[model samples]
Target: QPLEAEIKGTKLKAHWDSGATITCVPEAFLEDERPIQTMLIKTIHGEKQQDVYYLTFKVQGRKVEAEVLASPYDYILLNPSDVPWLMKKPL
Candidate 1:
């Protein structure tokens, strides 16, 4: 199954990777605000500091406000916890 989710109705394409301990979002879809604090997380690229932000959007008819880590990646990456909530599951 493919993990997917959307933000603010714009349709957010998502990638699911168990290796990611935290959800990652791209800067293009986010506002540039100083993070409340810096988070130290290790990624495939290596250790990096990221800013966390709350992103509001709808998933599977459920409105959600999620804390996401900002990154340079081109799309959203969700951990297994969110892999199945993006849309109505396939039959």
Candidate 2:
């Protein structure tokens, strides 16, 4: 599901993905220039290198802290691993 999120006082749209092992945010969305590290990330286009950043964001009124990768995608991609509550659904 797509939801509104806030990062460093910036508001953006984030999408929840159960299959993703990690979270991702667009490179442009990151106001901070410092990157934590670089690592190879697998995407639909295949494996590629991306800069990782430690960030804290709020989504669905829940606060989350995680290492997010920088991507070219427009919307922030959220993974279940970082937000355990996202895995919950109506029975």
Candidate 3:
């Protein structure tokens, strides 16, 4: 089944597996006036697909919500070698 959450009031939805989790945050939280931040994750049985995924939403150099998910064995090794490439190049 899929799970849904809200970040700074924006709605976001994602699939829920036994081991993986999803989180959300409001976009305004990244702004200077609001500067506050928070995160919420909804999880199930603690077992899901074996992969790592990231989601980032930002505006004007401010980050609203940044989320990450990983397989059980893949959690601690979150810093993949291509991180710089991913940020520098988007396709």
Candidate 4:
């Protein structure tokens, strides 16, 4: 299932999973924004280069800074690491 979300005025459906380490989105969902850098990552598809967006967005009404990876996947994946600040609150 996907949750409704918007970033930089771009509407998108975000899917959260505990198995994910960071947030990920497809290039088309960026609304024509360029990524800060291209990052190499390993996935089920094997090692590949992915565009990484450096932006501060909101999640659950909490401001979040994340490196959003651009891929062909339809929905974005978010996990605990993406909200470390909030997760670390009770640590």
lDDT of 4 by residue, 1-91 (tens): 5666666665667877767776887767566777888877788978977777876666756566688877788767777687555455443
Models ranked on lDDT: 2, 4, 1, 3
For residue 24, model 1's alpha carbon misses the true position, in angstroms, by 0.5
lDDT of 2 by residue, 1-91 (tens): 4778887777988998888888888877566556788887689978877778888888777787888887788889898888887677734
What TM-score does model 3 achieve against the real structure? 0.22
lDDT of 3 by residue, 49-70 (tens): 3222344433222353444433
Candidate 1 stretches greater than 4 Å from native: 32-34, 41-48, 82-91
**What ordering of candidates by TM-score runs from best to worst?**
2, 4, 1, 3
Model 4 is weakest, by summed lDDT over 10 consecutive residues, at 82-91
TM-score versus the correct structure, for each prediction: 0.63, 0.78, 0.22, 0.66
User: Quick one: best TM-score, which candidate?
Assistant: 2
- Candidate 3 local lDDT, residue 3: 35
lDDT of each: 0.67, 0.81, 0.34, 0.71
Off by over 4 Å in 3: 21-91
Q: Which candidate number would show the highest lDDT if scored against the true structure? A: 2
Rate residue 86 of model 1 by lDDT: 38
Better of 2 and 3 by TM-score: 2
- lDDT per residue (tens digit) for residues 1-91 in model 1: 5445778676766777777766677876666544556678799989977777777755545576666777787888776555444334655
* Model 1, C-alpha of 91: deviation from truth (Å): 8.6
